[PDB]
């Protein structure tokens, strides 16, 4: 086997075996010392050479002394068989695992609209007339310069301008110092409208030049002269981005004043600005003060309610900041205080709705994980089709992305919409970004409605060009969803899908990992020839914390189809039922029985279609189980209801008793004896490794003693006649 | 155990999660012994003065600090709280991790070298550190940590790996430097042990060996025994 071929000696270049991965310290860095470095070779023992030569000599005898007798008596199918990468292996921030990549979308032009209803945060250069001549000269230097520096600021998180750009461009260095000589002596009223221009429009959150430090003194001296909301503008001006540019004490002051003077902020929009700015608070105690206030001030319009959902969506209080011990599901009770306070207004007048205020509801609900707000959507179903032609490029994606996952990732719509929205997509196709395009390609496969005409002209080349690269890591997944829903099998396309993940410098996020592990067992069932090892290092960090059983406490509540048949399995009849059992940390089977590898999966309003067919999820899952020899009883919840009540219990018994026996035989027939075969071959691979090689060679001939063992080949015979041929 | 045996037989299949999980951590650590985590640490502090004497600080529960500098650099001595100092130990990474000190707008890199405690009283006397600068050589301690290998044939059975040195002293010339060293001893044997030059050949370009500290490259770290039965049979006979 392998070990006999081993070298008697290893050089210094061969002690450390090769690796699939480089480390982050083999990078090319500034300073370097390979040049002056000398090479070291491990010495050979002086007495070993006296052993190396002799064995070389006795081997040399038998070569000639036998040749003298003759005169007397006569692969890597990813990157081809050659060429393959080597993934850099590093330690990783949490950030890579919870970051929505900002490539593949002109973000800020898109993102500034959705807030634009908040007037007070809208930056205005001309509001600062004294410096507007200066500030604008700076931005010319930004875009006009080489690269795309300002455009890389929020986008390429690996890139910074507070150190690379501003600290080196000497024209700008003059300009920021022209400011400092002015900042101290301005009115206290112009400061926050300046800070917005720094943080967003210029990306100066740091205190490099020492600018904010002067703003603090000119600010803190006149805190009491401000109104309420003109302090909130500082909060959003500084704390909305990565460095909270201000200090602690200057923010504790703002943080302490405001929650005393909530009795005087006049409007509900003024709470909207407030909550959206104070969303990063770690203290729970004061979110309640806000929401306790909003439960007091009734709303009498419709733009107000939109202005709360879109804000309350992003500005939730995460559960990791909450304590470990707490009232059950208390995060939800924070929601419905609002949603019960809003449900009237958003429901009474939803016909009164327009394209700019249109988008923010679909988002506000999808981010809120509910299934109640259908009535607004029906009033929206009627809205789009009328204005279908006059729509913008922007209002198309968010609809296609919104209705796709309307009621908790179950869609909501009709064939009238999406068939109409093809044309609206075909109009603005060149204007969408790669994120928007994939999100269309999700919604159709989500319903199995892709035109074969539509995949050819636009999707097919787009994927061919950009699947291998030039595609952000987050957009592969909406593609990874759909293709398996399309049941595609073209290998040349799955290559690029894998080559990207292997080549991509960024690790896989847990936010987007569920497809990447589905698509694994998709390809493995089809193609066993691949090696997904590189495709696991990129998935290494996510799989550690990954568990499917976390879904249990929710499904136990919000699925009556699950329990009611579950009641029958346990109380009335008798099997070794288990319940939710996680299929290799990828699925959780609805109901199962073991050791027989049995499954009772269920269709429902989540998983059926208007046609009555299963959703393209519910056929995906039932492939993978069957691929791993895991019996199935695809139950349809309608048909079980239709059975007469006395015959509902035995009908399950008649099926399950049969599906058991099919597997009960299969275990006897194939697996049970076949494990001994692998076992007894596993036992050799150990005994192969326990060998004294020098003792076992003992010359050039190999004479192993052989143990006889009773083995019942009577069951299996393909392997007998497969081994008895090669072995002799 | 915590559930009756009669129920465990029904759920014997469940325990794959147990073993499939331990794949993940112990492999992750075993390959992450080498790499510094990419996470910035900061220590607010204050300057030294001739006024702040030791015993004055030590009722206030502050601590002195000392830094030794390198070529052409001056030394720096600072004041800090005790609970900062112990928290700096309490990381995994304390032997090498880069810690900063913010006095004001300034930051000073450092490493841990050691701490002295008053042994009879058992309170913190000082916390000593070593400067780090990018463009110049800097002393660090690279511990050696040996992986297990069931791929060699002598290592598996009746032999014993011998780690004669715990770490290596080097000089680093760049920002990110490796936390430690990890070895796969398959190709080693009784005949050849590992020697420091086998490491010197395999390092980044920014690293060099501090010959002032070590004795010779022909020095050896990992040694492997012979078999035990071949002794034991001879021991009895």
């Amino acid at each position: 086997f392998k070990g006999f071929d081993k070298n008697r000696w290893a050089t210094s270049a061969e002690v450390f075996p090769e690796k699939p991965f480089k480390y982050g310290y083999d990078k090319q860095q500034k300073i370097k010392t390979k040049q002056d470095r000398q090479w070291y070779e491990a010495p050979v023992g002086a007495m070993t050479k006296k052993r190396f030569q002799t064995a070389d000599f006795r081997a040399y005898q038998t070569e000639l002394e036998e040749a003298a007798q003759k005169t007397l008596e006569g692969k890597d199918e990813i990157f081809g068989e050659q060429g393959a990468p080597k993934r850099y292996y590093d330690r990783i921030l949490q950030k890579e695992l919870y970051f929505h990549h900002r490539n593949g979308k002109h973000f800020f032009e898109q993102a500034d609209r959705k807030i634009s209803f908040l007037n007070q945060f809208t930056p205005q250069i001309e509001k600062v007339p004294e410096l507007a001549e200066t500030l604008k000269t700076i931005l010319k230097i930004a875009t006009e310069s080489e690269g795309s520096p300002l455009k890389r600021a929020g986008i390429d998180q690996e890139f910074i301008i507070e150190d690379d750009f501003y600290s080196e461009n000497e024209e700008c260095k003059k300009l920021f110092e022209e400011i400092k000589q002015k900042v101290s002596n301005m009115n206290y009223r112009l400061l926050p409208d300046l800070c917005l221009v720094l943080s967003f429009k210029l990306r100066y959150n740091k205190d490099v030049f020492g600018i904010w430090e002067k703003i603090e003194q000119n600010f803190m001296q006149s805190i009491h002269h401000y109104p309420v909301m003109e302090l909130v503008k500082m909060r959003y001006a500084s704390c909305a981005l990565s460095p909270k540019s201000l200090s602690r004490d200057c923010l504790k002051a703002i943080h302490d004043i405001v929650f005393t003077e909530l009795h005087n902020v006049p409007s509900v929009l003024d709470l909207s600005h407030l909550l959206f700015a104070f969303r990063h608070i770690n203290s729970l105690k004061y979110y309640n003060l806000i929401l306790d206030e909003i439960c007091r001030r009734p709303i009498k319009t419709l733009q107000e309610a939109i202005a709360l959902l879109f804000v309350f969506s992003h500005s939730l209080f995460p559960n990791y900041k909450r304590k470990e011990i707490r009232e059950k599901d208390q995060d939800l009770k924070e929601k419905h205080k609002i949603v019960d306070h809003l449900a009237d207004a958003l429901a009474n007048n939803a016909k009164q709705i327009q394209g700019d205020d249109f988008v923010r509801v679909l988002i506000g609900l999808n981010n809120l994980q509910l299934t109640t707000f259908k009535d607004v959507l029906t009033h929206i179903e009627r809205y789009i089709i009328k204005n279908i032609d006059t729509l913008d490029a922007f209002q198309t994606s968010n609809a296609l992305y919104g209705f796709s996952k309307a009621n908790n990732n179950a869609g909501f719509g009709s064939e009238q919409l999406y068939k109409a929205l093809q044309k609206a997509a075909e109009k603005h196709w060149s204007q969408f970004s790669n994120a928007d395009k994939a999100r269309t390609f999700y919604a159709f496969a989500f319903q199995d409605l892709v035109d074969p005409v539509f995949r050819k002209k636009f999707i097919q080349p787009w994927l061919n060009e950009n699947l291998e690269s030039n595609l952000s890591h987050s957009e592969l997944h909406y593609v990874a969803f759909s293709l398996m829903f399309e049941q595609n099998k073209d290998a040349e396309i799955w290559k690029k899908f894998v080559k990207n993940i292997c080549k991509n410098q960024y690790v896989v996020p847990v936010l987007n990992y569920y497809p990447i592990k589905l698509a694994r067992y998709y390809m493995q069932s089809i193609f066993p020839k691949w090696n997904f090892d590189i495709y696991k290092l990129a998935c290494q960090d996510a799989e550690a914390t990954w568990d499917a059983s976390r879904q249990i406490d929710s499904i136990m509540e919000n699925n009556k189809e699950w329990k009611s048949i579950g009641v029958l399995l346990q109380n009335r009849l008798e099997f070794n039922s288990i319940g939710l059992d996680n299929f290799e940390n990828l699925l959780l089977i609805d109901w199962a029985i073991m050791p027989q590898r049995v499954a009772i999966m269920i269709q429902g309003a989540r998983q059926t279609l208007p046609n009555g067919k299963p959703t393209p999820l519910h056929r995906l899952k039932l492939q993978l189980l069957e691929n791993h020899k895991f019996a199935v009883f695809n139950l349809i919840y309608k048909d079980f209801e239709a059975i007469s009540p006395d015959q509902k219990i035995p009908y399950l018994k008649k099926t399950i008793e049969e599906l058991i026996a099919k597997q009960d035989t299969y275990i006897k027939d194939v697996e049970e004896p076949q494990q001994w075969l692998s076992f007894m071959d596993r036992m050799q691979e150990l005994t192969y490794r326990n060998i004294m090689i020098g003792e076992a060679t003992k010359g050039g001939v190999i004479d192993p003693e052989i143990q006889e063992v009773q083995f019942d080949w009577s069951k299996l015979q393909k392997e007998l006649k497969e081994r008895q041929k090669q072995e002799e | 155990t915590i559930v009756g045996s009669q129920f465990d037989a029904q759920t014997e299949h469940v325990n794959k999660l147990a073993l499939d999980l331990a794949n993940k951590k112990y492999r992750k650590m075993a390959l992450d012994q080498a790499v510094l985590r990419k996470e910035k640490v900061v220590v607010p502090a204050e300057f030294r003065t001739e006024k702040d004497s030791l015993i004055s600080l030590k009722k206030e529960l502050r601590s002195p600090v000392y830094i030794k500098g390198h070529t052409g650099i001056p030394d720096v001595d600072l004041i800090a709280d005790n609970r900062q100092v112990f928290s700096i130990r309490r990381r995994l990474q304390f032997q090498n991790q880069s810690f900063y000190f913010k006095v004001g707008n300034e930051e000073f890199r450092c490493t841990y070298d050691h701490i002295q405690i008053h042994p009879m009283e058992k309170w913190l006397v000082y916390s000593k550190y070593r400067r780090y600068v990018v463009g110049k050589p800097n002393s660090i301690f690279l511990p050696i940590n040996i992986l297990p290998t069931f791929q060699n044939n002598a290592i598996v059975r009746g032999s014993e790996i011998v780690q004669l040195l715990d770490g290596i002293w080097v000089n680093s010339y760049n920002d990110e430097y490796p936390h430690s060293i990890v070895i796969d001893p398959e190709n080693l044997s009784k005949i050849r042990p590992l020697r420091i030059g086998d490491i010197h050949n395999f390092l980044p370009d920014g690293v060099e060996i501090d010959k002032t500290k070590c004795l010779s490259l022909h020095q050896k770290v990992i040694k492997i025994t012979g078999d035990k039965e071949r002794k034991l049979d001879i021991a009895l006979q």
């Binding site: 006149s222 805190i223 009491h224 504790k252 302490d256 | 990419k38 910035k40 640490v41 900062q84």
Partner: peptide
């Protein structure tokens, strides 16, 4: 990834947790 995050290392025993109304920041200017 060139993130600005950084672990501050300091004892929270010193940091006072009290409230200061508009008045406290009004009077201190004078």
């Amino acid at each position: 990834m060139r993130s600005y995050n950084q672990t501050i290392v300091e004892n929270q025993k010193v940091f006072k947790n009290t409230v200061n109304d508009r008045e406290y920041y009004e009077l201190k200017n004078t």
